[PDB]
Amino acid sequence: PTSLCCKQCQETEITTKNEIFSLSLCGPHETLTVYKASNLNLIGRPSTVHSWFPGYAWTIAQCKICASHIGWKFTATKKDMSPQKFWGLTRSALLP
Ligand SMILES: O=C1CC[C@@H](N2C(=O)c3ccccc3C2=O)C(=O)N1
Ligand SMILES: [Zn+2]
């Protein structure tokens, strides 16, 4: 009911509406950023190439059940950043 599940298989809860926060600046969208996620397997090592959140690297994250590409784990390159990690999830890969 606050639950966001992999659209492809509908088995797994990936995150909840409670975990949602915003990195985007409110002064002078398609990607959902959450503090915490579940049931995702990480593929490969982190990379900073073309990172959508400067200062973070990304690791591909797919549903552990059906292997659908739901988003990425973003990890901080520097110790002084917060949060040190979060998830960027493709909204259309989630239900609702
Ligand atoms: O933060 C990110 C993570 C995902 C990442 N990405 C793509 O989705 C992608 C698709 C095809 C080639 C290269 C990339 C690429 O680096 C991207 O451009 N930025
Ligand atoms: Zn799935």
Residue numbers in the entry: 321 to 348, 360 to 427
The publication says:
In an effort to clarify the differences in CRBN binding at the structural level, we determined the structure of mouse CRBN TBD bound to (S)- or (R)-thalidomide and refined the structures at 1.8 Å and 2.0 Å resolution, respectively. Similarly, the 16 (R)-thalidomide molecules display essentially the same conformation, which is distinct from that of (S)-thalidomide and exhibit a small averaged rms deviation of 0.074 Å. In both enantiomeric structures, the phthalimide ring is tilted against the glutarimide ring by 75° so that two protruding carbonyl groups of the phthalimide ring are docked into grooves at the pocket entrance: the phthalimido 1-carbonyl group into the groove between Trp383 and Trp403, and the 3-carbonyl group into the groove between Trp389 and His381. In sharp contrast to the relaxed form of the bound (S)-thalidomide, CRBN-bound (R)-thalidomide has the glutarimide ring in a twisted conformation, which is distinct from the stereochemically relaxed C4-exo puckered conformation of (R)-thalidomide, suggesting that bound (R)-thalidomide is structurally constrained in a metastable conformational state. The twisted conformation is forced primarily by the contacts between the phthalimide ring and the entrance of the tri-Trp pocket and accompanies a large displacement (1.7 Å) of the phthalimide ring toward the endo direction. This displacement needs to avoid steric clash of the phthalimido-1-carbonyl group against the groove formed by Trp403 and Trp383, and enables the protruding carbonyl groups to dock into the grooves. To visualize the steric hindrance, we superimposed the free form of (R)-thalidomide onto the CRBN-bound form of (R)-thalidomide found in the crystal. We found that the C4-exo conformation of the free form causes serious steric clash (2.6 Å) of the phthalimido-1-carbonyl group against the ring carbon atom of Trp383 (indicated by a dotted line in Fig. 6). The twisted conformation of the bound (R)-thalidomide avoids this clash by shifting the phthalimide ring toward the endo direction (1.7 Å, green arrow). Moreover, close inspection of the glutarimide ring puckering by modelling revealed that (R)-thalidomide in the C4-exo puckered glutarimide ring conformation causes steric clash of the C4-carbon atom against Trp383.
